[PDB]
Design an enzyme around this catalytic site. Structure first.
Site, PDB file in Angstrom:
ATOM      1  N   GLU A 131      25.230  33.520  16.115  1.00  0.00           N
ATOM      2  CA  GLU A 131      24.401  32.329  16.197  1.00  0.00           C
ATOM      3  C   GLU A 131      24.410  31.713  14.814  1.00  0.00           C
ATOM      4  O   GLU A 131      23.941  32.321  13.845  1.00  0.00           O
ATOM      5  CB  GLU A 131      22.973  32.680  16.628  1.00  0.00           C
ATOM      6  CG  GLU A 131      21.976  31.511  16.563  1.00  0.00           C
ATOM      7  CD  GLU A 131      20.528  31.961  16.778  1.00  0.00           C
ATOM      8  OE1 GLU A 131      20.280  32.790  17.694  1.00  0.00           O
ATOM      9  OE2 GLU A 131      19.643  31.493  16.018  1.00  0.00           O
ATOM     10  N   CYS A 141      17.278  27.326  12.377  1.00  0.00           N
ATOM     11  CA  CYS A 141      18.533  26.785  12.902  1.00  0.00           C
ATOM     12  C   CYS A 141      18.281  25.714  13.947  1.00  0.00           C
ATOM     13  O   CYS A 141      19.151  24.905  14.220  1.00  0.00           O
ATOM     14  CB  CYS A 141      19.415  27.895  13.489  1.00  0.00           C
ATOM     15  SG  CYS A 141      20.017  29.079  12.227  1.00  0.00           S
TER      16      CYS A 141
END
Ligand SMILES: *[C]/[C]=[C]/N1=C2[C]=C([C])C([C])=[C]C2=N([C][C]([O])[C]([O])[C]([O])[C]OP([O])(=O)OP([O])(=O)O[C][C]2O[C](N3[C]=NC4=C3N=[C]N=C4[N])[C]([O])[C]2[O])C2=C1C(=O)[N]C(=O)[N]2
Lengths: 972, 978
Positions: free
Chosen positions: B734, B768
């Protein structure tokens, strides 16, 4: 109907004369009866007991016996009531002996004379393990010759069984005293309708040798009928031998009333006899292979050849018996049934039609209240097997199954204490009653594997030579690239030739340079946004259309593979049907996965999870499954909304062009599939490295696959995604042969797994790991079966395997063979044809250990390593000693060893008690990890996801303090 | 109570009798609004379309917007109901007329004129100021001054008003006793950052403005009522009232609203009355049932909080009658305003008051202006003392108020609907709601013994215990500082001599402890230990492996505030951010345990007889887990526990600056009794052992969350197969995002602005998923940025342990310098709109920063900054907005505020991020509800917290058995047979 009721009343009354004038298996005082009693009460126990009897004769040490007993029946406490080694051994052996007339010829002959003095005729049959070689067929044949010679010396002293007149030296004044039956496939280890003529002739040659001896003593020969696979072969053997000796009356054939075919087969046979003005004899049986035929047919999506309501077989019997009796002038009849209704029907029907007694007799199996039958009927012949206790044990299992079946007339008559009225019922009435007493999605049928080629059929047999010839009229074409819906020629042509006859050139293939590959990628990328936005159901529809396009060309598509890559007829057809299966299955999978699903259940919120395609997929296909794997990888990418640039393997480029033809017929939009055969050294890295590629589907060698994985990991300038790899690579697959393995099954399955399609399968058996104590026996039979097979052109169905893919494969495989011969010792190396063709001998090498190169490196050819394991722990350890983990097999009848293998023999596809090749869509999703792949399984429910990426849309549905209430909301 | 209940029912019957069959305008079939409501009540799809249309209506400021939304909500002309550019006119005019019906004016002088008309007809009034949500100090000041202006106008007028007639008292007062000027104020409109997370700050800010309004009210001897808003602010508002009351203990005309639909209200009412007695003051309570019923139920359900409202409507009615009786009994201390349009309720109050002989100056009745007209007139005739609640102001908040009225009138459970639309029986309408409750009360799935998955309850600062827990647990953490944390390998502690301190980013002089670093030797040892532990762990039953995660979850759950406090200090999480981190870790544990149990049973595949195929999954081996510092417990536990439960063994490298949080994995897994070597803890210098860990031949899987650069490097290196390497390495990754939120022309700015502010600056923008680009449509740009910047200006930057700060220091010195340089880059590219002050002295502070004029070609429109720097981008049309959203190399999260069905559809389709959010912030994905992750450069298409995740940690296997022996096979249940 009025007449029908009258005759039925006569049959019923006869039924009771048999019941008035009236077994060990139902006698609950003997150990056998108590075991069968519990068997019929408990199905779990029944399964354990019968499987134990099956494995019993392989239990040759105190250790094997003791452990299996525990493994099948548990401890000495939790067992049923009815020294464990001693109690079981003596009983099981006693049960087996009750069904055979001797273990030697002299004993059988002595027992047969005792039977005669009790007023019973006989038909003698030789017990044996399945014939797996020429030497075994010769042993079987010689046993009959030896038997006939013994009987020849004795029969002259036999008084004929008493009859109403005729010849007092003949049984009942008419029947020959010597009567034997032979199992046709026991005369030829490779009996197979795929090579119909070869099978007929080989069986017929041995049968003729037996028949001549039978005629020498004026005896009777009955030809037994075996499984549906060989029925047509057997009928033709009978027809040929009959006409060779048109004047000899004492030749018989068996017909099975449980076959839907039988009404026609009997009609045809009677008409045939009339046409040729010969007489025949038929032993009508219901049929011995019911469960097997049902299973076999359902496994191959064939029409079940047997009736499936038991009364339908009974009704068919009484119907076909009447037909024979009507035809008594030309057809002698042997009624072979233990069913009192069936027998009583035959007796009254013979009476109704006034059939002379010399035209019909009654037959029952030795060991299954015979006297009571003999009193009413009078002419009774016992089926009398003799021979070894090993096949005697398998025969016993059959008798146990037969007698304890729910539908068994015998079980019903005793064990159940049924109303005699229901027992002696006209089965036609039972039929109608039984008949009276009797899921896909999106509107599509559920998935089912495409039917396998079926060489019991005359049309399927004839189709291959026809289509191979038709393909031959289409040779010599130049094949272009296919880019963005247009044919694109280049000046670089590579020939594709027949590996079994390299002088035969099938065509010329244009090669894509990097410019042309770049064009196809550009075309794929331009088509992508529209294809991605196409509804999943609509995309699935193209696959369904392609599948129908393929289904319509099944034999034509097969024939190409026979010639272009040396597929055997069955292997070629299975390649095409697997392609069809991928199309049908992936279509359904996309439909299934194509609908966004709500996730979570919080109110005022909607989360939808769904999938998106990646972009342009490079598909780099192998030659060994040129339609199946190509179509599987390509259609998966396409149906998930990606666009494809497809590079077939060079030597199967024409099969690759078939994808073009199929997607074109399906009307796929331009640029969604592009066909760019090319030289790897020119454009291989270009294709893999290209920044517009988002996915690579590859199947082939580990070396190539690993390189692709390494290069694809780089993200280049302008590359939108991390490249997804879908890779299926090689195997070094072992089959383990445990001490208790059924070698009748293990040997041919191993042979097929190793040498099917010249061993050119990622799933192929290249190591057979054999337990110490069964080693010598196993290899002897394996090598002897191997010696019976023939190597040559795959277009000739008589050949077991043929030439390998090409010149390079041949040189590489031969080098490995030489390496292996320095590491181990050669056990067998076949002849190969002289002249042209990439032939590598069928090769078997023993003395192989895990440190040897040919124990480790994938050869991809007909070279089988045989390894001798000291115990089962070492066998497993050796199976796991390579860097691969694709497929594996184990022949074992030990629950404990099977449990250990399921846990520890960690291949992607482990097979138990069958070959380790021929994975089918849905049933056996295929693929592994380690150096064999990246854990992706084609033909399974996880596969399509690999070609996509998940997305979630989350919506706050609340406006101004209110939200719609949805179905699955957690609410109040 | 039979006798009183009979008086109430008869009182209700006379009431209905005197109404003479009259319907309120909303239920008039002859009127347009009635026709629209009639169809809404018959057709839920239409009701939703119609009410959402009224909500978006005041933003349809151009002819194109209006015409397009009309088509999108109602279809073409021949798709619409009969009662429905000329279409633009009849629709616009009718909606505006509907809204005006509920409002006493747009201007102060108009409101005043209309109040006088109302008095002529016999009605008193309470005036309330309509307004959009207060998002800034400027907006709170404009709201406050609107009241001050209104009071000045009423001061000049009231002297000339004759008091409404009564039976006694002061002829200068209404009914002889009520002040003529009566206003109501919404507390949270006085402070845009009102939040019980900052309880004291919220009370003070609101109180200070409320006090200014109150002094002016007192100056003309008027009445001030403090309205009650949503449950989130209920305790704050009660505290504001109590404090203001005590400042002016002698002033009688100060009221508070209490809500009978709250389970809390019996206690709250009792506490307030007791409090009033204790302090020897009087109070006034306007009792309502409650305005936010759907909202509270939805909000509680979304956070696994106990629903604060009754959920059977009659319970609220029964509560009202019970609480009204309590107030009337206490008429000496408590003045009562009955605020209800329900005739049973009204009748109950009337009869209870008569039965208790309550003086009439201790109770009056109130209804909403412009609705339940015959009820209003009936109250006037029977009770005499009726006060109209009179909203005034701008049509924009006027439309939102109208939507609420439409909802209130058309609800299935609405007394008004049942009386006036549904022709319900009078006896049923008037029955004792307590009876109704009993009758409704009596009229009213997980797998394998385990309850179904549900997300752990979020921290709830409406509770005093939750508010008090944080300072306490922070103090406790401070007694634990200064420890040395070793590696943990194969169940043992391994010390190295390379130590790196971990410090408080908001006060770097505060050292939390020292962390041992693993060299390649120790990492190799940890890998060897995981590999040795692998065979037994792999052979452990999946259900048994899941049980270890369940035990760790319970261990975490019992340490929730403690684990949270460590994060506040070590990495500068705000209180809520810290708690949410620990709950998310707990969710992963609970969810992955259930997922392994689901996936752990081999499944039969195919249905051919004589054959059993079983498909199942096997672990890969040793998993390297490389975890970020920004979600130090959550993502760590998620990646590690997924690898563990699927039968892999883990070598775990936490980020340096959150190594202590990483040690919590050791504590939790050891408390769960996890077998040795299954989890190994090896913090280390990436420059020493990073490549070594990833390159190692015995590694089979790598789970990484962090930067794109590191992620891509790992991907490239892991692809190589080294000598002795058993598997092709599996990557679960990720990586970053450059996430945009689109603000469409019709966006609800009251929601968009605070959601964008939180998305951009929550936890200093170090997510993020964080919004780093806000893409705003041309026509709404100036208004949006004004409100955004103004809200930003009200927030404070400072230490995260102080709950009054919105955001605090970033992770460490390197981050501060990196982000600050990006801000300078952005300020040369665009133009600075806001740059917050920061505290003086130590701390890694970066100003909350907003920069406009940003275009896709700019660096700060492309590169992930991971700090509090927001790019504002001005799009010329919706197509360009989408195009600009899609103009980066990332595709992690995205947002869109829009109320256009067509634009939302285009966004669902083309705004191709891993997680797209509609009309809410784009951060804080929850397990199961929002599986998180993307493709492009944001990831490899794996989604943590969802049902495809565990499969990435395993490989499938099939076992195929030929079950036929000697011609027979067991028949299995799912066999294709005969
Ligand atoms: C700013 C604000 C103000 N306020 C007010 C004032 C006045 C003067 C008045 C009159 C009012 C108000 N508000 C509003 C209210 O709340 C409302 O209106 C009420 O609630 C109404 O009611 P009624 O009229 O009595 O009627 P009904 O129909 O009877 O009732 C309804 C109700 O109920 C409830 N629910 C529903 N559903 C349910 C319930 N519960 C339970 N369960 C269920 N399911 C609700 O509540 C409704 O509504 C107000 C005010 C303030 O301040 N605050 C508030 O909150 N509100």
């Amino acid at each position: 109907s009025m007449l029908n009721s009258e005759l039925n009343t006569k049959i019923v009354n006869r039924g009771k004369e048999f019941f008035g004038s009236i077994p060990s298996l139902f006698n609950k005082g003997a150990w056998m009866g108590k075991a069968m009693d519990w068997s019929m009460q408990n199905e779990q126990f029944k399964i354990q007991m019968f499987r134990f009897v099956d494995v019993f004769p392989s239990l040759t040490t105190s250790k094997l016996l003791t452990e299996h007993i525990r493994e099948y029946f548990g401890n000495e406490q939790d067992m049923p009531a009815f020294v464990l080694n001693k109690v079981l051994t003596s009983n099981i052996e006693e049960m087996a002996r009750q069904f055979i007339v001797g273990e030697t010829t002299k004993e059988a002959v002595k027992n047969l004379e005792k039977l005669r003095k009790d007023g019973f005729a006989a038909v003698v049959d030789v017990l044996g393990e399945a014939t797996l070689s020429e030497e075994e067929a010769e042993v079987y044949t010689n046993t009959y010759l030896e038997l006939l010679e013994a009987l020849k010396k004795e029969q002259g002293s036999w008084k004929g069984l008493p009859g109403k007149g005729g010849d007092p030296g003949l049984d009942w004044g008419h029947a020959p005293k010597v009567n034997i039956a032979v199992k046709p496939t026991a005369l030829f280890c490779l009996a197979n309708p795929q090579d119909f003529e070869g099978s007929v002739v080989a069986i017929l040659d041995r049968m003729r040798r037996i028949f001549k001896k039978v005629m020498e003593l004026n005896g009777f020969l009955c030809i037994d009928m075996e499984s549906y696979r060989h029925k047509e072969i057997i009928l033709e053997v009978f027809r040929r031998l009959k006409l060779e000796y048109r004047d000899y009356p004492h030749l018989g054939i068996v017909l099975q009333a449980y076959l839907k075919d039988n009404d026609k087969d009997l009609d045809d046979l009677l008409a045939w006899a009339k046409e040729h003005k010969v007489q025949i004899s038929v032993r009508l049986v219901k049929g011995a292979y019911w469960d097997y035929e049902t299973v076999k047919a359902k496994q191959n999506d064939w029409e079940v050849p047997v009736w499936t309501i038991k009364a339908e077989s009974d009704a068919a019997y009484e119907r076909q018996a009447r037909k024979i009796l009507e035809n008594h002038q030309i057809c002698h009849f042997a009624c072979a049934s233990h069913n009192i209704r069936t027998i009583s029907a035959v007796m009254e029907m013979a009476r109704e039609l006034n059939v002379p007694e010399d035209r019909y007799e009654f037959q029952v199996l030795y060991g299954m209240v015979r006297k009571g039958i003999l009193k009413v009927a009078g002419r009774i012949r016992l089926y009398a097997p003799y021979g070894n206790m090993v096949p005697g044990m398998g025969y016993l299992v059959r008798r146990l199954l037969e007698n304890t079946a729910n539908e068994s007339f015998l079980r019903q008559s005793f064990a159940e204490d049924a109303q005699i009225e229901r027992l002696l019922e006209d089965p036609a009435v039972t039929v109608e009653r039984e008949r009276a007493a009797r899921k896909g999605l999106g509107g599509l049928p559920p998935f089912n594997n495409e039917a396998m080629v079926d060489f019991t059929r005359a049309d399927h047999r004839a189709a291959f030579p026809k289509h191979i010839a038709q393909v031959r009229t289409q040779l010599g074409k130049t094949y272009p690239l296919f880019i963005n819906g247009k044919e694109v020629r280049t000046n670089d042509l590579i020939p594709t030739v027949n590996p079994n006859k390299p002088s035969e050139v099938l065509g010329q293939i244009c090669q894509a340079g990097t410019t042309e590959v770049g064009d196809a990628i550009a075309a794929a990328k331009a088509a992508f946004p529209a294809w991605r936005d196409t509804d999943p159901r609509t995309r699935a529809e193209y696959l369904l259309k392609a599948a129908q396009a393929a289904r319509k060309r099944l034999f034509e598509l097969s024939a190409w593979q026979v010639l272009e890559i040396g597929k055997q007829w069955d292997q070629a057809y299975a390649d095409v049907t697997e392609a069809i299966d991928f199309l049908e299955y992936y279509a359904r999978e996309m439909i299934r996965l194509g609908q966004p699903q709500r996730v979570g259940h919080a109110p005022g919120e909607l989360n939808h999870y769904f999938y998106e395609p990646k972009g342009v997929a490079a598909v780099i296909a192998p030659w060994n499954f040129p339609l199946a794997i190509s179509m599987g990888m390509a259609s998966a990418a396409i149906v998930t909304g990606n666009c494809v640039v497809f590079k077939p393997s060079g030597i199967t480029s024409i099969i690759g062009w078939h994808l073009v033809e199929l997607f074109r017929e399906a009307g796929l939009p331009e640029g969604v599939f592009n066909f760019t055969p090319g030289r790897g050294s020119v454009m291989g890295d270009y294709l893999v490295d290209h920044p517009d590629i988002s996915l690579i589907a590859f199947t082939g060698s580990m070396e190539t696959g690993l390189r692709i994985i390494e290069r694809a990991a780089k993200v280049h300038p302008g590359q939108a995604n991390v490249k997804k790899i879908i890779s299926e690579m090689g195997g070094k697959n072992a089959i383990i042969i445990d001490d208790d393995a059924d070698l009748d099954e293990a040997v041919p399955h191993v042979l097929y797994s190793a040498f099917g399609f010249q061993g050119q399968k990622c799933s192929a058996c290249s190591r057979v790991i054999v337990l110490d104590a069964v080693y010598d026996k196993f290899i002897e039979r394996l090598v002897s079966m191997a010696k019976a097979t023939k190597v040559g052109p795959s277009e000739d169905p008589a050949n077991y395997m043929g030439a390998v893919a090409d010149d390079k494969a041949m040189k590489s495989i031969k080098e490995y063979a030489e390496i292996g011969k320095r590491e181990g010792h050669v056990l067998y190396e076949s002849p190969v044809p002289a002249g042209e063709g990439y032939f590598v001998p069928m090769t078997i090498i023993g003395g192989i250990k895990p440190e040897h190169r040919i124990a480790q490196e994938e050869i991809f050819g007909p070279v089988l390593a045989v390894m001798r394991a000291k115990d089962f722990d070492q066998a497993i350890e050796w199976a796991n000693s390579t860097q691969f983990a694709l497929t594996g097999g184990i022949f074992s009848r030990s629950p404990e060893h099977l449990a250990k293998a399921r846990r520890e023999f960690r291949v992607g596809n482990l097979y138990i008690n069958r070959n380790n090749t021929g994975a089918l869509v849905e049933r056996q999703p295929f693929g592994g990890a380690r150096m064999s792949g990246v854990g992706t399984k084609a033909g399974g429910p996880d596969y399509l996801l690999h070609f996509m990426d998940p997305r979630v849309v989350t919506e706050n549905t609340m406006r101004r303090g209110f939200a719609p209430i949805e179905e699955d909301d957690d609410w109040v």
